[PDB]
Each structure stands twice: as C-alpha cells, then as structure tokens.
C-alpha cells in the first residue's frame, strides 16, 4: 500500500503539472499569434514603401545635376559682371 | 495487488511522457517567439528606413524645384546682360 500511496500522489502531481504547463503554453500561443499579426503588417508596410529608396537616389542625382548647372550659370554671370567692373 | 500497481505505474508513465512532450512543445514555442521578436524589430527598422527615404525623397524634390527656379532667375539676369 505504501507504493500505491506513493504512485497515487505522484500521478496527482503529474496531473497538476500537465495543467500548469498547459496554462503557460496558452500564454505563449497568444504571444506567437500577436507577433505573427504584427510581423505581417510591418512586412506589408515595408514592401509598399520600398520604392522610395529608388526614388530618393534618383531624385538626389537629379538635384545634384541641376545644382551643378545652376552653379555654372552663376559663375558665368559673376565673370560677366567682373569683366564689366 | 501487484498488477494494480502496474496499471497505475503505466498511467503515471504516460502522464510523465505527455508532460515532457508539452515541455518540448514549449521549447519550440520559445524559439518561435525569439525568432519572431528578432524578425519584427528588423522589419520595424527597415520600414522606418523606407520612411526616412520617403522623407528625403520629398526633400530632394523640393530642393530640385527651388534650384530650378534659381537657375531660371540666373538665366534671365544673364539674358538681360547679354542683350
């Protein structure tokens, strides 16, 4: 009977541990589902915005080019004024 | 009643196997959570990086329009002087 009492007590300890682990697993499932939703959202948002890397680099090059053209005109004008000084 | 102890012994062993298997499932979920947390921070920064490119793109476009106006104004001054 003492082996029987020992087995019965341990089985009840196992049943409580099964429930405890399950509650912890329930929480982790909710975390995983929320992270999955957030990651899918962020992934879509990044993809829709990806074009701006390309457009930024193209726009910057265009800006640098017209700035160079403008500076050339400014130099021509300054020279023409100084030639007439 | 030795076969009765066997019976209960069998039930306890199954409970311990199911318990261990839940733990193994938890281990996999903790790994999932860690990988997702990393992927989400990475994606959040990458989205933020695209937002910086968007801001800078619009700022470059604004600068380009202003420089174009300035160039037209200089071109006019030159035209007045060369006429």
């Amino acid at each position: 009977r003492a082996v029987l009492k020992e087995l019965s007590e341990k089985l009840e300890l196992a049943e409580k541990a099964l429930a405890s682990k399950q509650l912890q697993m329930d929480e982790m499932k909710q975390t995983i589902a929320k992270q999955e939703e957030d990651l899918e959202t962020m992934t879509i948002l990044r993809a829709q915005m990806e074009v701006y890397s390309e457009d930024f680099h193209a726009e910057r090059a265009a800006r640098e080019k017209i700035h160079e053209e403008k500076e050339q005109l400014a130099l021509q004008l300054a020279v023409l004024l100084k030639e007439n000084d | 009643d030795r076969a009765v102890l066997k019976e209960l012994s069998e039930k306890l062993e199954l409970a311990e196997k199911a318990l261990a298997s839940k733990q193994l499932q938890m281990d996999e979920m903790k790994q999932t959570i860690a990988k997702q947390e990393e992927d989400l921070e990475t994606m959040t920064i990458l989205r933020a990086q695209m937002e910086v490119y968007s801001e800078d793109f619009h700022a470059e476009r604004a600068a380009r329009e202003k420089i174009h106006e300035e160039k037209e104004q200089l071109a006019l001054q030159l035209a007045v002087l060369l006429k």
Binding site: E6, L13, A17 | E16, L19, Q23
Partner: peptide, 29 residues
C-alpha cells in the same frame, strides 16, 4: 523511480518530484 537527475540543469531530484525543483522541467524532457 528513486531519485533522478534533471537532464538540463543536472540537479538530482527526489523520487516524488515530476518537475525539476530548480528549473521545473519534466523528468523526461
């Protein structure tokens, strides 16, 4: 059963335990 060693933290647990007393992992995990 008798005492059993936790296969993660190496602590030797009492026969009555089903979870490790240190790390709470089940004996067969």
């Amino acid at each position: 059963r008798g005492r059993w060693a936790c296969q993660s933290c190496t602590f030797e647990n009492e026969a009555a335990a089903v979870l490790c007393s240190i790390c709470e992992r089940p004996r067969l995990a």
